[PDB]
Amino acid sequence: KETIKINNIMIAKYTVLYTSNCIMDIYSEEEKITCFSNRLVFLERGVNISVRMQKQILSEKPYVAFRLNGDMLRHLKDALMIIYGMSRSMSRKIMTTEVNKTLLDELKNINSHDNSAFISSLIYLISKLENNEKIIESIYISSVSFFSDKVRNLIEKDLSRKWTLGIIADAFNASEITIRKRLESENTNFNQILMQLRMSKAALLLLENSYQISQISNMIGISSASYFIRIFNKHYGVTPKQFFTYF
Amino acid sequence: KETIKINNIMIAKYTVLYTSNCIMDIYSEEEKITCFSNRLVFLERGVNISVRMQKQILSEKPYVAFRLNGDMLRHLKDALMIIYGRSMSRKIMTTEVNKTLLDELKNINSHDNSAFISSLIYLISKLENNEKIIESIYISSVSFFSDKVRNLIEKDLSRKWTLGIIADAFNASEITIRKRLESENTNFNQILMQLRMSKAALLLLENSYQISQISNMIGISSASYFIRIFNKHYGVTPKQFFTYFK
């Protein structure tokens, strides 16, 4: 059909999504946010969400996404801390707004080149928005580094290794218990971090259409291909085929 | 007529001007830059220029100006230093304004400094060879010696300032103050004259004050003296200046 329900979607980069040809019911932090067609969604870095999407036009893609790397996010952060002044609910983590045709011109003039101009245009849009304070807080709070972030960096160094909690401890020159606490404070466990890393990398590589499922599996650190397919299903709720075909 | 030539116009705030209904021949540093109608001009802080303006429609104002205070300029500077990392040609720069950029030029407001600095960012991003403009903003964000003297004199434009006073204030010698000022091609008397004549021009255009009031405000004893000095400095009578700018 034109309808999908994907689970455990992790936002790893500050994301600005334009619903375009899809209606999205987002479930996160035991809350529900419905994004209508022709809206802009602001997903902050780190929210684990689930989505129920209904495509309007089937032949085309669902939505239009804009993800911000660390450098761009930090620069936007500092710019917003100069422009609008220096400085825990889903309502302030996933925020939807209505986009004007004038803003639509910029939404078509967005380009992955001229990153200077891209950050400028984000500044401009944020300026042209009612109640932008919410959005602004997200951009800044999504710039801080947590345990989940340092652990994720260390694990991203070699996703194929047989990581354990002892390894993490040795690397951080601390004890297993202490690492367990830096994680538990942020409602995560080492196994969850590792599983999200691998399934997110796998989803991206899958959509790249440049790699076999065996290649994807060996890349993220999974031994067999059948095993990988079963885990992808158990995590997202769909087979890599269903996921790929939907987009 | 609809044509005026004003001398010794000093830009005290980074200025973005929309020529609108005027043709401007700007003369400075033995150079000539002609801004055509329906253009945007970027004049950096500090350029002493002379202008020949030609109005297309007489009843209206010549141009539409946008001046940046120190704090706003500094904030724009910092934003531009996060985003992007000697000749008049790189101090006075003119460009053609697009309907989109013009629409933003109308969506300006002197209250939401955040929105204005953002709009400057947006426009600057949409510009060919914007590096020139950006350099102007950053060099016009620098604090020179002449600016410190200017602020000190600004504290009380009516006082009979002398070079001894300025020297004592900076805890240095007269020679040193004179030469540090001369390094930026200025003298204490020029700083004071520019301060008073600029404040006078603004007050005059405010249409809320008489020439006697203007005179006493900038620190000048008689009104006749003020008018003669205004004419000698800018080249026009306060009447001519005012009537030209409606």
Short mmCIF file of C-alpha atoms in Angstrom, two decimals:
data_model
loop_
_atom_site.label_atom_id
_atom_site.label_comp_id
_atom_site.label_asym_id
_atom_site.label_seq_id
_atom_site.Cartn_x
_atom_site.Cartn_y
_atom_site.Cartn_z
CA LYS A 1 0.00 0.00 0.00
CA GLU A 2 0.90 3.68 0.35
CA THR A 3 0.97 3.32 4.13
CA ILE A 4 3.90 2.35 6.34
CA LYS A 5 4.55 2.21 10.08
CA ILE A 6 8.25 2.27 10.92
CA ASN A 7 9.40 1.87 14.50
CA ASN A 8 12.50 2.97 16.42
CA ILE A 9 13.53 5.72 14.03
CA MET A 10 16.44 7.60 15.61
CA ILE A 11 17.14 11.21 14.65
CA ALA A 12 20.93 11.44 14.61
CA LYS A 13 21.26 14.82 12.89
CA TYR A 14 19.10 17.89 13.45
CA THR A 15 16.37 17.33 10.86
CA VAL A 16 14.06 19.71 9.02
CA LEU A 17 11.49 17.67 7.11
CA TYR A 18 8.93 18.95 4.58
CA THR A 19 5.99 16.53 4.66
CA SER A 20 5.27 17.19 0.97
CA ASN A 21 3.43 14.09 -0.36
CA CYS A 22 2.76 12.33 2.96
CA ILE A 23 0.74 12.63 6.18
CA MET A 24 2.80 11.60 9.23
CA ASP A 25 1.55 10.53 12.66
CA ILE A 26 4.65 10.65 14.90
CA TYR A 27 4.66 8.72 18.18
CA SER A 28 7.39 9.60 20.64
CA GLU A 29 7.77 10.00 24.43
CA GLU A 30 4.25 8.52 24.77
CA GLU A 31 2.80 11.37 22.70
CA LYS A 32 1.31 11.77 19.22
CA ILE A 33 2.00 14.62 16.77
CA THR A 34 0.21 14.63 13.40
CA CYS A 35 2.00 16.48 10.58
CA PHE A 36 -0.30 17.43 7.69
CA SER A 37 0.66 17.88 4.05
CA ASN A 38 2.64 21.02 3.16
CA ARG A 39 4.10 21.55 6.65
CA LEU A 40 7.60 21.80 8.11
CA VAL A 41 8.74 19.48 10.90
CA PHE A 42 11.68 20.18 13.20
CA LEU A 43 13.08 17.01 14.76
CA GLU A 44 15.83 17.55 17.30
CA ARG A 45 18.91 15.38 17.46
CA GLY A 46 18.34 12.28 19.59
CA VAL A 47 14.56 11.75 19.63
CA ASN A 48 13.70 8.10 19.06
CA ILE A 49 10.37 8.27 17.25
CA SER A 50 7.98 5.96 15.42
CA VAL A 51 6.08 7.14 12.36
CA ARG A 52 2.88 6.13 10.59
CA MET A 53 3.11 7.61 7.08
CA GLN A 54 0.42 7.79 4.39
CA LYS A 55 1.64 8.85 0.94
CA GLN A 56 -0.59 11.17 -1.09
CA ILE A 57 1.00 10.46 -4.49
CA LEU A 58 2.39 6.95 -4.77
CA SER A 59 4.77 7.39 -7.72
CA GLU A 60 6.78 10.05 -5.88
CA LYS A 61 8.82 10.09 -2.68
CA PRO A 62 7.10 10.71 0.69
CA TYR A 63 8.87 13.77 2.10
CA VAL A 64 11.85 16.12 1.62
CA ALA A 65 14.51 15.98 4.34
CA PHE A 66 17.32 18.34 5.42
CA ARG A 67 19.82 16.92 7.93
CA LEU A 68 22.51 18.99 9.67
CA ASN A 69 25.97 17.62 10.39
CA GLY A 70 27.89 18.54 13.53
CA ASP A 71 29.75 21.46 11.94
CA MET A 72 26.65 23.06 10.42
CA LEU A 73 24.60 22.48 13.57
CA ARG A 74 27.28 24.09 15.76
CA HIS A 75 27.64 27.10 13.44
CA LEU A 76 23.85 27.60 13.34
CA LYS A 77 23.87 27.29 17.14
CA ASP A 78 26.45 30.05 17.56
CA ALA A 79 24.75 32.27 14.97
CA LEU A 80 21.45 31.88 16.83
CA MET A 81 23.19 32.59 20.12
CA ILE A 82 24.39 35.90 18.69
CA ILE A 83 21.26 36.86 16.75
CA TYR A 84 18.51 36.00 19.27
CA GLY A 85 20.64 36.21 22.41
CA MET A 86 22.64 33.71 24.44
CA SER A 87 21.27 30.86 26.57
CA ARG A 88 11.96 18.22 28.43
CA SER A 89 8.71 17.47 26.55
CA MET A 90 8.12 16.16 23.02
CA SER A 91 6.16 19.33 22.23
CA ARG A 92 9.50 21.17 22.45
CA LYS A 93 11.43 18.38 20.66
CA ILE A 94 9.23 17.74 17.59
CA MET A 95 7.67 20.94 16.27
CA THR A 96 5.49 21.44 13.17
CA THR A 97 4.65 24.72 11.45
CA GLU A 98 2.96 26.02 8.31
CA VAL A 99 5.24 27.16 5.48
CA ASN A 100 4.47 30.18 3.32
CA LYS A 101 4.96 30.36 -0.46
CA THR A 102 7.65 32.99 0.09
CA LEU A 103 9.42 30.52 2.38
CA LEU A 104 8.67 27.92 -0.33
CA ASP A 105 10.98 29.84 -2.66
CA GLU A 106 13.82 29.28 -0.19
CA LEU A 107 12.63 25.67 0.31
CA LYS A 108 13.41 25.20 -3.38
CA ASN A 109 16.58 27.36 -3.23
CA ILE A 110 18.08 25.10 -0.54
CA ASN A 111 21.33 23.61 -1.85
CA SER A 112 23.86 21.30 -0.24
CA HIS A 113 26.55 23.47 -1.80
CA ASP A 114 27.24 27.00 -0.50
CA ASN A 115 26.88 25.86 3.12
CA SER A 116 27.36 29.49 4.15
CA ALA A 117 24.21 30.39 2.20
CA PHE A 118 22.40 27.33 3.60
CA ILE A 119 23.02 28.37 7.22
CA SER A 120 22.05 31.91 6.20
CA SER A 121 18.74 30.62 4.83
CA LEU A 122 18.08 28.68 8.03
CA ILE A 123 18.69 31.91 9.95
CA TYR A 124 16.28 33.71 7.62
CA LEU A 125 13.52 31.09 7.95
CA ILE A 126 13.85 30.90 11.74
CA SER A 127 13.58 34.69 11.74
CA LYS A 128 10.39 34.58 9.65
CA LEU A 129 8.54 32.21 12.01
CA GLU A 130 5.91 32.73 14.69
CA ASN A 131 6.98 31.33 18.07
CA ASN A 132 10.45 30.38 16.83
CA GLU A 133 11.72 30.18 20.44
CA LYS A 134 10.69 26.51 20.58
CA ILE A 135 12.60 25.74 17.40
CA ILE A 136 15.59 27.76 18.56
CA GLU A 137 15.86 25.86 21.84
CA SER A 138 15.95 22.57 19.93
CA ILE A 139 18.86 23.71 17.76
CA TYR A 140 20.84 24.66 20.85
CA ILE A 141 19.92 21.69 23.04
CA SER A 142 20.70 19.35 20.13
CA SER A 143 24.28 20.74 20.16
CA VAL A 144 25.39 19.35 23.59
CA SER A 145 27.46 16.10 23.90
CA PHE A 146 26.06 13.26 26.06
CA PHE A 147 27.31 9.77 26.96
CA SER A 148 25.29 8.43 24.06
CA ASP A 149 27.33 10.77 21.84
CA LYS A 150 30.82 9.90 23.10
CA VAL A 151 30.04 6.16 23.19
CA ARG A 152 28.55 6.48 19.70
CA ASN A 153 31.73 8.16 18.43
CA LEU A 154 33.96 5.46 19.93
CA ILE A 155 31.77 2.70 18.47
CA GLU A 156 31.60 4.47 15.09
CA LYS A 157 35.38 4.16 14.96
CA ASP A 158 34.97 0.38 14.34
CA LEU A 159 31.33 -0.76 14.07
CA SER A 160 32.51 -4.29 13.17
CA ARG A 161 34.35 -4.97 16.45
CA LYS A 162 32.94 -7.14 19.25
CA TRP A 163 32.27 -4.29 21.66
CA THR A 164 31.50 -5.03 25.30
CA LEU A 165 30.94 -2.86 28.36
CA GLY A 166 34.45 -3.68 29.56
CA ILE A 167 35.93 -2.27 26.35
CA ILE A 168 33.93 0.96 26.78
CA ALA A 169 35.12 1.15 30.39
CA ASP A 170 38.81 0.67 29.50
CA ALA A 171 38.57 3.28 26.73
CA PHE A 172 36.96 5.80 29.11
CA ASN A 173 39.44 4.73 31.84
CA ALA A 174 36.60 4.02 34.26
CA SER A 175 34.68 1.08 35.74
CA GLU A 176 31.77 -0.81 34.16
CA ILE A 177 29.40 0.46 36.88
CA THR A 178 30.33 4.09 36.16
CA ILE A 179 29.72 3.70 32.41
CA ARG A 180 26.40 1.99 33.21
CA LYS A 181 25.48 5.10 35.23
CA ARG A 182 26.46 7.69 32.56
CA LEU A 183 24.14 5.66 30.28
CA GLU A 184 21.26 5.02 32.71
CA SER A 185 21.03 8.72 33.56
CA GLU A 186 20.06 9.31 29.91
CA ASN A 187 17.71 6.25 29.70
CA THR A 188 19.95 4.15 27.44
CA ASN A 189 22.02 0.98 27.57
CA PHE A 190 25.19 0.12 25.67
CA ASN A 191 23.34 -2.53 23.67
CA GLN A 192 20.73 0.04 22.64
CA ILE A 193 23.38 2.51 21.46
CA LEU A 194 25.09 -0.20 19.42
CA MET A 195 21.82 -1.49 17.92
CA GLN A 196 20.71 2.01 16.92
CA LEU A 197 24.10 2.81 15.38
CA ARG A 198 24.04 -0.34 13.26
CA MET A 199 20.38 -0.11 12.20
CA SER A 200 20.69 3.59 11.28
CA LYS A 201 23.86 3.05 9.24
CA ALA A 202 22.08 0.09 7.62
CA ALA A 203 18.99 2.11 6.71
CA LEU A 204 21.14 4.83 5.10
CA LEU A 205 23.30 2.35 3.14
CA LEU A 206 20.13 0.55 2.04
CA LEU A 207 18.58 3.73 0.65
CA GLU A 208 21.86 4.54 -1.13
CA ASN A 209 21.04 1.71 -3.60
CA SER A 210 24.81 1.20 -4.06
CA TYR A 211 25.32 -1.81 -1.79
CA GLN A 212 24.14 -5.37 -1.49
CA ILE A 213 22.43 -6.61 1.67
CA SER A 214 25.45 -8.83 2.28
CA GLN A 215 27.64 -5.74 1.83
CA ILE A 216 25.46 -3.68 4.18
CA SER A 217 25.52 -6.49 6.76
CA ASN A 218 29.30 -6.87 6.72
CA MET A 219 29.69 -3.08 6.81
CA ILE A 220 27.67 -2.38 9.94
CA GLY A 221 29.25 -5.36 11.70
CA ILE A 222 26.72 -8.21 11.25
CA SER A 223 28.02 -11.67 10.35
CA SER A 224 25.26 -13.20 8.21
CA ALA A 225 22.84 -11.58 5.78
CA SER A 226 19.74 -13.52 6.88
CA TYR A 227 20.53 -12.52 10.47
CA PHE A 228 20.75 -8.88 9.40
CA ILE A 229 17.39 -9.05 7.61
CA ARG A 230 15.72 -10.56 10.68
CA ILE A 231 17.21 -7.90 12.97
CA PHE A 232 16.21 -5.04 10.64
CA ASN A 233 12.66 -6.39 10.66
CA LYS A 234 12.58 -6.82 14.47
CA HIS A 235 13.84 -3.27 14.99
CA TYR A 236 11.97 -1.24 12.37
CA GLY A 237 8.99 -3.57 11.94
CA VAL A 238 9.51 -3.85 8.17
CA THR A 239 11.74 -5.85 5.94
CA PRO A 240 14.59 -4.00 4.21
CA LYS A 241 12.54 -4.61 1.03
CA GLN A 242 9.40 -2.88 2.39
CA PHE A 243 11.47 0.01 3.75
CA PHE A 244 13.41 0.43 0.49
CA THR A 245 10.34 0.15 -1.77
CA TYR A 246 8.42 2.71 0.27
CA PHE A 247 10.95 5.46 -0.48
CA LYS B 1 16.77 72.57 -8.98
CA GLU B 2 16.42 68.86 -8.22
CA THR B 3 20.21 68.51 -8.16
CA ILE B 4 22.42 69.07 -5.10
CA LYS B 5 26.11 68.58 -4.29
CA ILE B 6 26.83 68.11 -0.58
CA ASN B 7 30.41 68.04 0.68
CA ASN B 8 32.11 66.46 3.71
CA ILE B 9 29.42 63.88 4.34
CA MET B 10 30.80 61.56 7.01
CA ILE B 11 29.36 58.06 7.37
CA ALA B 12 29.18 57.40 11.12
CA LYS B 13 27.18 54.15 10.96
CA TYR B 14 27.47 51.33 8.43
CA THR B 15 24.93 52.44 5.83
CA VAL B 16 22.86 50.45 3.35
CA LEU B 17 21.16 52.92 1.03
CA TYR B 18 18.48 52.39 -1.63
CA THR B 19 19.06 55.05 -4.29
CA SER B 20 15.36 54.88 -5.16
CA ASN B 21 14.56 58.20 -6.84
CA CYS B 22 18.09 59.64 -7.18
CA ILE B 23 21.33 59.31 -9.17
CA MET B 24 24.36 59.69 -6.88
CA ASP B 25 27.90 60.53 -7.97
CA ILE B 26 30.08 59.78 -4.93
CA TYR B 27 33.54 61.40 -4.88
CA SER B 28 36.10 60.27 -2.34
CA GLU B 29 39.83 59.53 -2.28
CA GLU B 30 40.22 61.08 -5.77
CA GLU B 31 37.67 58.60 -7.15
CA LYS B 32 34.13 58.66 -8.55
CA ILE B 33 31.46 55.98 -8.06
CA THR B 34 28.08 56.52 -9.75
CA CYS B 35 25.05 54.78 -8.23
CA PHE B 36 22.11 54.48 -10.64
CA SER B 37 18.41 54.40 -9.80
CA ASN B 38 16.91 51.32 -8.09
CA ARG B 39 20.22 50.15 -6.60
CA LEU B 40 21.66 49.25 -3.20
CA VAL B 41 24.76 51.06 -1.91
CA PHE B 42 26.94 49.80 0.94
CA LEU B 43 28.95 52.59 2.56
CA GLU B 44 31.34 51.54 5.31
CA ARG B 45 31.65 53.40 8.58
CA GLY B 46 34.06 56.34 8.42
CA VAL B 47 34.27 57.27 4.72
CA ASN B 48 34.26 61.03 4.27
CA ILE B 49 32.56 61.45 0.90
CA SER B 50 31.08 64.18 -1.26
CA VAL B 51 27.94 63.47 -3.27
CA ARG B 52 26.15 64.88 -6.32
CA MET B 53 22.52 63.79 -6.16
CA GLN B 54 20.02 64.14 -8.99
CA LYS B 55 16.36 63.62 -8.06
CA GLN B 56 14.04 61.94 -10.55
CA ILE B 57 10.84 62.90 -8.69
CA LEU B 58 11.20 66.12 -6.70
CA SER B 59 8.32 65.94 -4.19
CA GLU B 60 9.62 62.74 -2.58
CA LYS B 61 12.78 61.97 -0.66
CA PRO B 62 15.95 61.15 -2.62
CA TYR B 63 16.86 57.76 -1.16
CA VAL B 64 15.95 55.25 1.56
CA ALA B 65 18.63 54.70 4.20
CA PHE B 66 19.43 51.91 6.69
CA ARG B 67 22.02 52.72 9.38
CA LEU B 68 23.61 50.18 11.76
CA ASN B 69 24.47 51.09 15.35
CA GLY B 70 27.63 49.80 16.99
CA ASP B 71 25.98 46.85 18.75
CA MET B 72 23.99 45.78 15.68
CA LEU B 73 27.11 46.09 13.51
CA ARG B 74 29.12 43.99 15.99
CA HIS B 75 26.45 41.27 16.08
CA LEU B 76 26.31 41.18 12.26
CA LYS B 77 30.12 40.99 12.27
CA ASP B 78 30.09 37.99 14.62
CA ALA B 79 27.41 36.20 12.59
CA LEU B 80 29.47 36.78 9.45
CA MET B 81 32.58 35.48 11.23
CA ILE B 82 30.77 32.24 12.04
CA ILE B 83 29.15 31.78 8.64
CA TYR B 84 32.01 32.67 6.28
CA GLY B 85 34.91 32.02 8.67
CA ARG B 86 42.61 50.44 1.05
CA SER B 87 40.62 51.64 -1.95
CA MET B 88 37.27 53.40 -2.19
CA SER B 89 36.12 50.60 -4.53
CA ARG B 90 35.98 48.25 -1.51
CA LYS B 91 34.45 50.88 0.79
CA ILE B 92 31.55 52.12 -1.38
CA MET B 93 29.87 49.25 -3.25
CA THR B 94 26.71 49.34 -5.36
CA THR B 95 24.54 46.43 -6.52
CA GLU B 96 21.24 45.76 -8.31
CA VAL B 97 18.25 44.92 -6.11
CA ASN B 98 15.99 41.98 -6.94
CA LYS B 99 12.26 41.83 -6.29
CA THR B 100 12.91 39.17 -3.62
CA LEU B 101 15.73 41.14 -1.99
CA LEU B 102 13.59 44.27 -2.31
CA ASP B 103 10.68 42.49 -0.61
CA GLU B 104 13.00 41.86 2.32
CA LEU B 105 14.14 45.49 2.04
CA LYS B 106 10.52 46.44 2.75
CA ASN B 107 10.17 43.85 5.54
CA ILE B 108 12.55 45.87 7.72
CA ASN B 109 11.76 47.15 11.20
CA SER B 110 13.67 49.21 13.80
CA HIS B 111 12.58 47.03 16.75
CA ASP B 112 13.33 43.33 16.12
CA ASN B 113 17.10 43.63 15.81
CA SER B 114 17.14 39.83 15.52
CA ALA B 115 14.95 39.94 12.40
CA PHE B 116 16.97 42.75 10.81
CA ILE B 117 20.37 41.13 11.37
CA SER B 118 18.89 37.89 9.99
CA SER B 119 17.64 39.73 6.90
CA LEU B 120 21.07 41.26 6.35
CA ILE B 121 22.55 37.75 6.60
CA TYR B 122 20.01 36.50 4.06
CA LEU B 123 20.62 39.33 1.58
CA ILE B 124 24.42 39.11 1.92
CA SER B 125 24.16 35.39 1.16
CA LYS B 126 22.24 36.20 -2.06
CA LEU B 127 24.93 38.51 -3.50
CA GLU B 128 27.64 38.20 -6.14
CA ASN B 129 31.06 39.18 -4.80
CA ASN B 130 29.66 39.65 -1.31
CA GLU B 131 33.17 39.33 0.17
CA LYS B 132 33.67 43.05 -0.53
CA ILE B 133 30.59 43.95 1.53
CA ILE B 134 31.60 41.54 4.31
CA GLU B 135 35.10 43.04 4.54
CA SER B 136 33.51 46.49 4.75
CA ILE B 137 31.33 45.36 7.66
CA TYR B 138 34.26 43.84 9.52
CA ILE B 139 36.67 46.74 9.01
CA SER B 140 33.84 49.13 9.94
CA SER B 141 33.44 47.09 13.13
CA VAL B 142 37.00 47.91 14.26
CA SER B 143 37.52 50.55 16.97
CA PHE B 144 40.15 53.16 16.05
CA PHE B 145 41.73 55.97 18.05
CA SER B 146 39.66 58.60 16.22
CA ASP B 147 36.55 56.74 17.41
CA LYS B 148 37.66 56.93 21.04
CA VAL B 149 38.26 60.67 20.71
CA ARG B 150 34.87 60.90 18.97
CA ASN B 151 33.06 59.18 21.85
CA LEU B 152 34.85 61.30 24.47
CA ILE B 153 33.83 64.49 22.65
CA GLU B 154 30.33 63.01 22.17
CA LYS B 155 29.86 62.93 25.95
CA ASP B 156 29.47 66.75 25.93
CA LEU B 157 29.46 68.37 22.47
CA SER B 158 28.93 71.78 24.14
CA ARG B 159 32.21 71.83 26.08
CA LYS B 160 35.13 73.91 24.79
CA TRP B 161 37.29 70.87 24.07
CA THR B 162 40.99 71.38 23.42
CA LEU B 163 43.89 69.10 22.55
CA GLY B 164 45.24 69.32 26.09
CA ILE B 165 41.97 67.88 27.42
CA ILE B 166 42.04 64.99 24.92
CA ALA B 167 45.72 64.32 25.66
CA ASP B 168 45.20 64.26 29.44
CA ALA B 169 42.19 61.96 29.02
CA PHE B 170 44.23 59.39 27.07
CA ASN B 171 47.15 59.80 29.55
CA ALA B 172 49.58 60.63 26.76
CA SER B 173 51.20 63.72 25.25
CA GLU B 174 49.68 66.21 22.79
CA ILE B 175 52.18 65.16 20.09
CA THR B 176 51.15 61.52 20.44
CA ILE B 177 47.40 62.25 20.28
CA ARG B 178 47.87 64.53 17.25
CA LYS B 179 49.89 61.95 15.37
CA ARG B 180 47.78 58.92 16.32
CA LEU B 181 44.86 60.99 15.00
CA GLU B 182 46.84 62.02 11.90
CA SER B 183 47.58 58.35 11.16
CA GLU B 184 43.89 58.02 10.17
CA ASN B 185 44.12 61.33 8.25
CA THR B 186 42.29 63.36 10.89
CA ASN B 187 42.86 66.22 13.28
CA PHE B 188 41.05 66.92 16.56
CA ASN B 189 39.36 69.97 14.98
CA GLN B 190 38.04 67.82 12.12
CA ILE B 191 36.66 65.25 14.58
CA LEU B 192 34.86 67.97 16.55
CA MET B 193 33.57 69.74 13.42
CA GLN B 194 32.31 66.45 11.98
CA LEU B 195 30.57 65.50 15.24
CA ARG B 196 28.78 68.83 15.48
CA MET B 197 27.87 69.10 11.79
CA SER B 198 26.58 65.50 11.67
CA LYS B 199 24.45 65.91 14.80
CA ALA B 200 23.22 69.19 13.28
CA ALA B 201 22.28 67.55 9.97
CA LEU B 202 20.28 64.84 11.77
CA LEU B 203 18.54 67.35 14.07
CA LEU B 204 17.72 69.55 11.07
CA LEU B 205 16.12 66.67 9.18
CA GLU B 206 14.10 65.73 12.28
CA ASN B 207 11.90 68.78 11.55
CA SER B 208 11.36 69.20 15.33
CA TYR B 209 13.88 71.94 16.11
CA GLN B 210 14.78 75.52 15.19
CA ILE B 211 18.22 76.62 14.01
CA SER B 212 18.80 78.34 17.37
CA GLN B 213 17.99 75.05 19.12
CA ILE B 214 20.22 73.05 16.77
CA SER B 215 23.04 75.56 17.30
CA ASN B 216 22.82 75.45 21.07
CA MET B 217 22.57 71.65 21.04
CA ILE B 218 25.69 70.95 19.00
CA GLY B 219 27.56 73.52 21.11
CA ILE B 220 27.59 76.67 18.96
CA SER B 221 26.95 80.08 20.50
CA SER B 222 25.02 82.05 17.86
CA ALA B 223 22.71 80.82 15.11
CA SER B 224 24.36 82.99 12.44
CA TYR B 225 27.68 81.32 13.23
CA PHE B 226 26.04 77.88 12.94
CA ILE B 227 24.51 78.65 9.53
CA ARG B 228 27.76 80.09 8.15
CA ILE B 229 29.74 77.05 9.35
CA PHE B 230 27.10 74.61 8.04
CA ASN B 231 27.27 76.29 4.63
CA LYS B 232 31.10 76.39 4.64
CA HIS B 233 31.27 72.70 5.62
CA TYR B 234 28.57 70.97 3.57
CA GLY B 235 28.38 73.56 0.79
CA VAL B 236 24.63 74.22 1.23
CA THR B 237 22.41 76.28 3.49
CA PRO B 238 20.55 74.38 6.23
CA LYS B 239 17.48 75.50 4.28
CA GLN B 240 18.76 73.96 1.02
CA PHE B 241 19.78 70.73 2.77
CA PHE B 242 16.41 70.43 4.53
CA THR B 243 14.26 71.26 1.49
CA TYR B 244 16.17 68.81 -0.69
CA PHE B 245 15.42 65.96 1.75
CA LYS B 246 11.78 66.89 2.51
#
